[PDB]
Amino acid sequence: MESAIGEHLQCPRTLTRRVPDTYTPPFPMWVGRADDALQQVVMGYLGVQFRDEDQRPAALQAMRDIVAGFDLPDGPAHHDLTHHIDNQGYENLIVVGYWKDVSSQHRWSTSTPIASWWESEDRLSDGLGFFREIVAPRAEQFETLYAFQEDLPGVGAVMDGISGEINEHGYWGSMRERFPISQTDWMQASGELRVIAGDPAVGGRVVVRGHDNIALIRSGQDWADAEADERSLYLDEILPTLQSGMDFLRDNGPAVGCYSNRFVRNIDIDGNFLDLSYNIGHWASLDQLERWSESHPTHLRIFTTFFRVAAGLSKLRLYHEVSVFDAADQLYEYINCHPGTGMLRDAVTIAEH
């Protein structure tokens, strides 16, 4: 069978898999492929936060501004827009942009129209919350998994195409084995999530730096093309358990090592919901994410259902992308956001270490 690891990224092993070579997965799954040209991607999550109804027009307008900024030279190759309400009652609009290289994202982010907007004093006077959570995993530092072959969402949309059926899935620990770097590296977490400028308690501008091997999961659900019966199976039998799991991580993050958990719903440019959703989960380690997925009743509750429906699962599209990053490849920046927003919640303030 094909390997999840791109051919050019395969190397002599110092670390090995947990399954013998005779292993065959019990159902088909696929991964994103890209050739040697793709060395490091950028995933830029750009947010707008508000709580009061009277702020919605401005918030939607700001989102429209960000989206228009993407049509400028060196904008992302792909993007999508989502909405969610956090556990503080704040509505969050997030535009996720995907770039195929670090330098293009850097040229874009520092270009006059983009940088002037971000650095403007008007960002403080808007009354809105703004955030940029921008992370840049190397090709060896992310994995993808799709229960379908076409029209790849997220980072798969900027990769070169789709694989054949892959070997490394269907067992706990398979995710890790899909990271090309797992051939040689433990992806061990070290360091702390640190505030390097500002104070979450004061609001205004706050800058948080990530630590080595924070993991980010985007795990998605797409029921936009499902027929009535499959819609009901997802909405009545799968979603409740997924929602329970997302609520848990959202409200018990520090206990399990989840710095931030968002369960978001895709929207159009005007804020109308689309029938796609995903988790955006930032984790203190890859192994903590492994521990939760393989042992918590919620994900286990969630998980067997897929194994049952996989055979006939007909139009529901499920997938995830998981990434790890060097400390230097993560930037989490906040303007006038509540102190529980994203990486503000668990970050250690200038005195807390």
Residue 290 binding ligand HEM, by CB under 6 A: yes
Q: Which residue of the set 296, 320, 338, 353 is catalytic?
A: 320
Which residues from 147-176 bind ligand HEM, rule CB under 6 A?
169-170, 172-175
Half-sphere exposure of 326 (CA within 13 A, CB side): 10
- Residue 73 φ/ψ region, left for φ over 0, alpha for ψ in the -120 to 50 degree band, beta for the rest: beta
Q: Could you confirm whether 320 is annotated as catalytic?
A: yes
| Entry field: residues in the chain | 353
**d(Cα 142, Cα 9) in Å, to the nearest integer?**
12
Handedness of CA 65, 68, 74, 78 (dihedral sign): positive
Q: Residue 14 binds what, of ligand HEM, a copy of itself, none (CB under 5 to 8 Å, by partner type)?
A: a copy of itself
Q: Which is nearer to a copy of itself, 207 or 309 (CB)?
A: 309
Q: Which does 281 bind (CB under 5 to 8 A by kind): a copy of itself, ligand HEM, none?
A: ligand HEM
- Judged by CB under 6 A, the number of residues near ligand HEM is 25
**Minimum Å distance from CB 55 to a copy of itself?**
42
Q: Annotated binding site for an aliphatic aldoxime: which residue ranges?
A: 219, 320
- Give the residue among 309, 314, 332 at the shortest CA–CA distance from 260: 332
d(CA 10, CA 222): 31
Distance CA 141, CA 101 (A): 14
Which letter does DSSP use for residue 54 in this model?
G
Q: Is 287 in the site for a copy of itself (CB under 8 A)?
A: yes
- Any residues with CB less than 8 A from the CB of 274 and at least 6 apart, and which? 224, 265, 266, 267, 268
Q: Which is nearer to ligand HEM, 109 or 167 (CB)?
A: 167
Instruction: Give yes or no for residue 326 binding a copy of itself (CB under 8 A).
Output: no
DSSP string, 308-332: HHTTT--S-EEEEEEEEE-GGGEEE
Contact characters 7-26, a copy of itself, x per CB under 8 A: -------xxx-xxxxxx---
Q: Which is nearer to a copy of itself, 117 or 171 (CB)?
A: 171
Q: Does 189 bind a copy of itself (CB under 8 A)?
A: yes
| Structure tokens given for 114 | 């983009």
Near a copy of itself by CB under 8 A: residue from 74, 212, 247, 294: 294
Can you tell me whether residue 172 is helix, strand or coil? coil
Q: Candidates 2, 165, 303, 349: give the one binding ligand HEM (CB under 6 A).
A: 303
- Positions touching a copy of itself (CB under 8 A) are 14-16, 18-23, 171-173, 176, 186-189, 285, 287, 290-291, 294-295, 297, 300, 303-304, 307
Please identify every residue annotated as catalytic: 320
